[PDB]
Design a protein around this ligand. Sequence first.
Ligand SMILES: [O-][O-]
Ligand SMILES: [Cu+2]
Ligand SMILES: [Cu+2]
Ligand SMILES: [Cu+2]
Ligand SMILES: [Cu+2]
Length: 501
Amino acid sequence: TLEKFVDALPIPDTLKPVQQSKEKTYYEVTMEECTHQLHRDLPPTRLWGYNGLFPGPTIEVKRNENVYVKWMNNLPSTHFLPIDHTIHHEEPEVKTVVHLHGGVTPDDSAGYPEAWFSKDFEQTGPYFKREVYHYPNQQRGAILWYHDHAMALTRLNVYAGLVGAYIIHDPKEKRLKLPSDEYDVPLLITDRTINEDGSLFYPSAPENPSPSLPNPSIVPAFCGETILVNGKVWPYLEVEPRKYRFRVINASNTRTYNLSLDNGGDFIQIGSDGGLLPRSVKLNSFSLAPAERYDIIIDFTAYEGESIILANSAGCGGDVNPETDANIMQFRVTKPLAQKDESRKPKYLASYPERIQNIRTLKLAGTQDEYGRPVLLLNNKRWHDPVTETPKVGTTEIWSIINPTRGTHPIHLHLVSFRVLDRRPFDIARYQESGELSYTGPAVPPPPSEKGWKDTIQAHAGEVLRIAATFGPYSGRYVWHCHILEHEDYDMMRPMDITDP
Ligand SMILES: [O-][O-]
Ligand SMILES: [Cu+2]
Ligand SMILES: [Cu+2]
Ligand SMILES: [Cu+2]
Ligand SMILES: [Cu+2]
């Protein structure tokens, strides 16, 4: 297999505005098919990249900065990854739309799966309204990320390389003196399988297919043989012996990580999806499902000279392999100090996170299609079925998510962030047989990591997860879905209409 830790970690350049004034910041980002080397020992790989880059450029904005991004499709008219036409029913083959994940945006700038467009906007989906997206950024400082969200193609377009980081900086947080600038580094983690000729591999069918099954066929999960951070296989990063802030983003299709440091040292978590936690949290390890973000500090001060592996204990389709997917990247504490470390790891970060208008019971279920494939469904509805999740703007609801399946689903709501209330185990067999919910244990409050603001949340097997969200500030057409892209595309995604009575 590919030799670990021979390439330096790329750090995406920060995007520069096409035009900027005190009143408006205007960016242009074009999707392009490009070639990039993923590892010292591979031929260059054909990829799709925002501005031809994988990951795309990091976008940095201030809270309340009035930002517009014209996302453009300049991609080939044919895909290079296997499209399954059976999963969705004259349209272009390559459809794209950019979703600012965690963004608080009007609905027509949110990247709705049916607001897609082909090259040069020649054809546009049924809910397309605009070319230039508006991001008012009137929301908490946080780590966001952007990625393709096109109907029935998300797993493919994201796997092709269409992901990037988007950081909101709230100037009110500057006084905390968290590690900043060169000492504040995003880590976009994406697992991939790569052929010997350097081409991306994505499966065209499940294992040992019926013959029979459409070809290509969607698969219900994807586990890559190799781990990349910031577009490089198993990279190293030379760090100074001092505190760093890392914006850890899981940009993988299916894979969940469980991260630790191989010297047994601690992370300090300072932030979750929705921004700074009320208090910093000392952690030895953490799980990180698709689309979750952990904003962390690692203090290398006492580790000068050392090589420390960011390790992973979570398997994907099997036990983790010590020589491969057990590794993420390697820190080498060998960079000389550019200056005194004047950063801080404060205990007190932010304030702690209303009438309950509605309690919504939701189940994670599904059925089998005519080919015998599993179709994952929220409340046994298709995407296309009339909308049922219709919160009223400005009101708070509790959503109670029942998971009687065998696996965890990272459930994501667009627009809002939410609080995690609790998780409670139930009798799966009794639920499947009668629809009756019978608890087998008391409710468990969230771990400290989940006591702030979240937008993507692990709903574990045989549990009811309860979250609470206030729906706003915008009314309109949004989405909620599982963020395992293989599940999202078939068909674990539903409209979420926030209404204005
Ligand atoms: O967010 O998909
Ligand atoms: Cu997302
Ligand atoms: Cu989202
Ligand atoms: Cu799922
Ligand atoms: Cu989404």
